[PDB]
Design a protein around this ligand. Sequence first.
Ligand SMILES: [Li+]
Lengths: 232, 251
Amino acid sequence: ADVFHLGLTKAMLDGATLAIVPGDPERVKRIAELMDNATFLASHREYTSYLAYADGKPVVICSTGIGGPSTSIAVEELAQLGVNTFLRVGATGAIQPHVNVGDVIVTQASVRLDGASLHFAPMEFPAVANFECTTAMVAACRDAGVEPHIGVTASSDTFYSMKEWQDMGVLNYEMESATLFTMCATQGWRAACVAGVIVNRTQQEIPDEATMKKTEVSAVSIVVAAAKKLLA
Amino acid sequence: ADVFHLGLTKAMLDGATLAIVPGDPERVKRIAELMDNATFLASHREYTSYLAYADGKPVVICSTGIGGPSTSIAVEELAQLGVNTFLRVGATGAIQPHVNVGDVIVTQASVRLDGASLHFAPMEFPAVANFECTTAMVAACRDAGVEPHIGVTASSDTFYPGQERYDTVTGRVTRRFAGSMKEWQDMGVLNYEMESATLFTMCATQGWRAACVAGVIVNRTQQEIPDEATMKKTEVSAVSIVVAAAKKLLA
Ligand SMILES: [Li+]
């Protein structure tokens, strides 16, 4: 392979410059299949990678695993293979009372509660998403009839102080976006992040299973839509 | 499943209270298969789990993924399923001149260059391995004719910057991690890896036992390229040693 973990060479990406980077190896295939000619590329460790074509252009779809360390490896190695744009999609839990199950969040920037971002920039640096990529995500939500909650996500190193984040308007919690955003911002790659809200931590009620699958479907559909806007 | 990620129920471990926790999901079977009656349990995301029997007692073998965050989930969920001892086995790169490809490191404690350890203790708390499990690891090494290097490992949240790797894209490391490898070498730090400070801090603070052993597959101080066959032999050796140590601790 040309890189140490993903088991990929550059020719395998067929020129892809954009990656969709979900957390779960097991979700890669189904996201690739929303595009054309989905093709398994490799699977090592938690990194499952597919190629597919979005409006005729090559996109790589590659799992990050859970957390900033494993993500950092996937992002750095995809960048070595020419990817300069990275769109995260994921399912998240909201911490704001009126961000409901089935809503979508576009993360514009993240609270850096992760260790890995600190390998890329001192803490003072903002874990901020790329403006154009975030714009595309928001456009893709709107095209789908969805008004995204756009704002700040708490990005942490353990599965998941909360009140502190709520009073500061933080929308949700996840584990990879601070790392993603900081490493990409600091090295000249573009990143954005969309997530379907599958649960609301302020809420009594347990989320409906069918709602949660529909929501995740929506988020994957949005990110693919955003990827086509950016490769237009 | 009784836990959120591993896809396991308590009954599936059949009473096991000791886990062998390699990084790589594709190594779990091989380890399970050095013991008796190895059985596939589950595979969800980066967690592949098997059960097997060491001289009659069940051992769970479960991958952690790379890094403290993914490891913390596996460790927390295995403890919920009743595991109280976690033996990590890995392959690693030495940073000390005389620690040769083929040697073995037993990590007694780790430099906490990770973020997940901070969820379990403030940075002043030592990322220290349990003394009895480290003792079993050393004995297992010696039984295999191997004098392990016992010392401090640097445990990092990146493969690249926090490990002072410059054969990257930008070929730049943040100030924090510039000169840092040589810093660790001067402090007698044996090697780098990415999970043991989380493992050891979360275990120590919550009353579980952890130890870690690793085969040296590369020496970052040597120009000589590591040999393919030695690396496999070293990896086989690290895995038999951790199986031996589990046997000692369950005897
Ligand atoms: Li992982």
